[PDB]
Amino acid sequence: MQIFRDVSKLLVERVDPKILNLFRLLGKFGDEVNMPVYVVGGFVRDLLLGIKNLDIDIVVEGNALEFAEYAKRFLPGKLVKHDKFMTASLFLKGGLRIDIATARLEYYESPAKLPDVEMSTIKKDLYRRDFTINAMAIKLNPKDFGLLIDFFGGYRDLKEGVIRVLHTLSFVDDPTRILRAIRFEQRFDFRIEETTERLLKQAVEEGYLERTTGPRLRQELEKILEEKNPLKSIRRMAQFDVIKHLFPKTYYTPSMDEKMENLFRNIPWVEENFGEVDRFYAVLHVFLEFYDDESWKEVRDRYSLRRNLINEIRHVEKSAPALLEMLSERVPASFVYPLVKGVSNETICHFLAYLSGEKEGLFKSYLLKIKNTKLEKINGEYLIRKGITSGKIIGEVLEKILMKKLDGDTRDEEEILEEVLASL
After folding, report:
1. How far apart are alpha carbons 74 and 408 in whole angstroms?
2. Would the annotation count 241 as a binding residue?
3. Stretch (H or E) spanning 116
4. What is the set of domains in the chain, with CATH numbers?
5. What family does this chain come from, according to its entry (predicted)?
6. In the chain, after which residues does the backbone break, taking C–N over 2.5 angstroms as a break?
7. 150 is in an annotated binding site
């Protein structure tokens, strides 16, 4: 099994020359300060897959700051230190930005957060990363420029479309990789090789997800949501029984899957007509239907959710059956007003998770009819106080006019006279 391979030709072929020359310079600085320099990770994966990947991620076997400082005086830019054991970024005025980190090992005392010491060679720094396809480096120092360093069978695992962990305790160490594996599985068209699959299942069914902290998990979750085909990933989690270990009161059923399918289908039509949609919460609107208060507080606290969220979910889960019936009978827009009156985009999606076909089509417009062509034109409360006093009664009036209007009457101030007649 080949570890070292000359990928020089491939780099000159695929990488922008302005940037290739930079990699060269960096290598050269490495020698001039006696640090081995490497580009690592996704960039190398992406190169070999022939996938554009612009950013530059540098690993040095030495002091990151020394190197960034040295680099800085030949590459005019802004040098930010960081809070990471030895991490810096040089922001070049030309636009692009260099990340620079010291090669590090991770040792795990428990299945939580690892000890780090720089006291690592590049080997150890690669050995601690998640999957073989992400654990590859290319050396930038002049004599070794364009050398693929692949300790773990990553090149081969690309050509076989495989997601494979680097050692046996990989999931137990960081159970966050359970979600990450699915994510890169759907992101390329990859499969989780047998052995690692078994490892994944053990970790899932032995409590490892619960043993990890909420925030870490949430973040890998949002990341899944922003990937290309989230629904695939979600179904993959369910295939692996992950969802229930993430949310102990949610059961992923053919019923839930349908809603979830409707959900995603309709989500962009909502970002389209209504603005930004937090996909994490949209998905929770479904996951968390029918949660009891204590099951909720447990989940609300583990992942850090808004307190009101259970209220909004409950509004949809409770009003959903009524909503279907109203869309069956082509009831007037005025009748679905109270259900969506001033609700979150996420709640909207959640309503859309229940429908398809004609009901979706109608509801979709009723919604647009509300978004716009809402909006009183002339009538204020103060257009009303010229003829009529307070107070609940004027508001009542304004909404009746709004409402007769939603079904729609294009003119006006007949509507007021018209409905004050109704009031008698």
Report:
1. 68
2. no
3. strand 116-117
4. 1-159 (3.30.460.10), 160-424 (1.10.3090.10)
5. Belongs to the tRNA nucleotidyltransferase/poly(A) polymerase family.
6. none
7. no
